[PDB]
């Protein structure tokens with residue numbers, strides 16, 4: 001069986017927790033229940049008729065992750081950097097995450113840049129075009145999700161797994 005580790009990154013408002021909660025438990029909250037500690041969640045997939053065990057890590061801040069990373073996260077096979085399509089400050093802050101991540105981990109890890117909250121399209125404040133160009137130029141693939149409406153999520157994780165394989 002394959003065993004993979006994936007870590008979730010991005011600013012508060014973005015929906016890291018909502019992404020992995022929806023995926024692993026099919027649950028969602030409108031309340032922002034802020035993530036005080038590293039948490040992990042699991043998912044058994046099947047790809048090429050082979051069982052894939054997936055541990056998904058959800059993080060409690062840039063500073064904590066930054067101090068913990070070199071000790072506790074150097075064996076990560078993928079990383080999902082999330083931003084909120086309705087929040088410009090959050091997408092621009094992804095650059096910070098990409099660099100810091102790569103300044104700590106190999107390039108062997110598969111990066112995803114995730115524009116979450118596509119149920120709020122009417123409030124879009126981030127150009128698809130700009131985000132896609134950014135993803136492409138750091139070797140990340142780009143993805144759109146809604147955790148609230150459960151769209152993009154199963155595909156995001158499956159593709160990340162195919163990639164990590």
Ligand SMILES: Nc1nc2c(ncn2[C@@H]2O[C@H](COP(=O)(O)OP(=O)(O)NP(=O)(O)O)[C@@H](O)[C@H]2O)c(=O)[nH]1
Pocket residue numbers: 010011012013014015016017018019029030031032033034035059060061116117118119120145146147148149
């Ligand atoms: N409309 C909408 N809201 C979403 C979506 N995903 C998350 N949210 C909302 O965004 C807020 C924060 O979500 P949350 O998962 O807690 O964010 P987080 O990235 O874990 N924050 P923290 O870093 O503080 O733990 C909540 O009000 C949550 O319901 C989405 O797809 N659509």
Ligand SMILES: [Mg+2]
Pocket residue numbers: 016017018033034035058
């Ligand atoms: Mg959280």
